[PDB]
Design a protein around this ligand. Structure first.
Ligand SMILES: [Mn+2]
Ligand SMILES: [Mn+2]
Lengths: 252, 249
């Protein structure tokens, strides 16, 4: 691309490899940003410190919340108990950087866990076990199938008109998405607008009202994003918003 | 203000997915010394992306890694089962870019070996196959606390960077967790320290304000070690001078 590439801050996840706590970022989340024209930089959880975060935000043109096997701690939306696979450090950074980016009108694109981070950060709640709700489809992947089958198309979603997805996808009101999540949106705050739903009524995409571009999707558009026309448009729209944010940063 | 430190990541396979990784003990050492670390994915090795990102960096941080530099990058041939070509590409590119821009560099273990290769040097791929050398590798079966325990001595070569940060002491003990080491050191570099067997354990780039590499692991509980604390503080101080340099232009 003949392009100045906006700086995209990518929230990392925590893992432990060979005896050491490690900050990680899957390459497929990176490849999708690159293909769309972004300049990604990975953000460790230590940056959640307020004095460091305030110094970094002016240098970020967009915030990128990847998915992850971990689930948000239930106490962050007022519930008791725990769930398997927690990442309290990512929770800390995600909540802080979302709230900061929403006040600074920095574009946000959130995937799977990121959407759930968006819902919780703005006052919503999550279903902790979608499989325990009889009215819903099976939104989880089959973990014993190979990776390619896990990210294959799983169910359809229907776009709710009047939001970001309608502007980005004028023709498509309905399309196929993959599904790899055992948790999902339960209560969505009035600060958020519903963007799409699976045929069982589950919210699969949201966006922040009165924000230029704060979009979350429950599926995984980063999966071979260059090969999927719909995934390409979503990342293209995110980068275009960051370009607009750069241009808007000189009309303040 | 805390200088922005660009940290080179490593590639790993986790749950069947290629993943860029960065151990927290490298990040914690930068945080304690006063730096603001951001992790640099391998895809940033693209020249256009690197050129856009370098003005926003105040220093470059090359951590250690289990992986080794591919021998063809210094003109040799051989197998390397634990390789990371993505890290190899980014490290050489950002080292070269940082050397031309006078951006401070601090490199650890694999970072030192990257410094030697990027400036025209070579490496010993099997230190264990040389009977004159000490055992520089760690025992992977011991607990991690004694894996990073002090293992052998080093002697500072006076007149360089290490003599500026530690003018009083020329000899100290360091941990050792490497099976590879510097062989030929280019004249662009000056030797900063050697172990008693003669192996180079620290280098710095002549003609540069602060481009230092060490073969040991000073990030391990860095705040609790006198030498480790001094090395990271000197790196951050170097980065602050680079910030004032950019603001004067
Ligand atoms: Mn789903
Ligand atoms: Mn050694």
């Amino acid at each position: 691309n003949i392009m100045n590439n906006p700086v995209i801050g990518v929230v990392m996840c925590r893992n432990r490899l060979k005896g050491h706590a490690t900050q990680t970022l899957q390459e497929k989340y990176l490849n999708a940003i690159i293909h769309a024209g972004g300049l990604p930089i990975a953000l460790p959880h230590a940056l959640a410190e307020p004095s460091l975060l305030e110094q970094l935000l002016p240098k970020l043109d967009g915030i990128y919340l990847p998915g992850s096997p971990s689930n948000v701690q239930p106490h962050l939306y007022g519930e008791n108990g725990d769930e398997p696979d927690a990442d309290p450090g990512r929770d800390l950074l995600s909540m802080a950087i979302i709230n900061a980016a929403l006040e600074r009108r920095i574009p946000i694109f959130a995937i799977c866990r990121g959407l759930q981070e968006l819902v919780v950060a703005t006052g919503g709640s999550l279903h902790r076990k979608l499989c325990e709700q009889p009215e819903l489809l099976e939104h989880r992947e089959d973990p014993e199938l190979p990776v390619e089958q896990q990210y294959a198309p799983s169910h359809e979603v229907q776009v709710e008109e009047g939001g970001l997805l309608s502007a980005l996808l004028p023709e498509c009101s309905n399309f196929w998405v993959n599904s790899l999540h055992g948790q999902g949106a339960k209560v969505v705050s009035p600060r958020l607008r519903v963007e799409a739903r699976s045929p069982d009524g589950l919210v699969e995409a949201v966006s922040v009202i009165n924000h230029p571009f704060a979009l979350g999707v429950q599926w995984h558009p980063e999966w071979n994003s260059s090969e999927y026309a719909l995934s390409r448009i979503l990342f293209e729209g995110f980068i275009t918003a960051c370009q607009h944010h750069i241009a808007e940063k000189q009309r303040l």
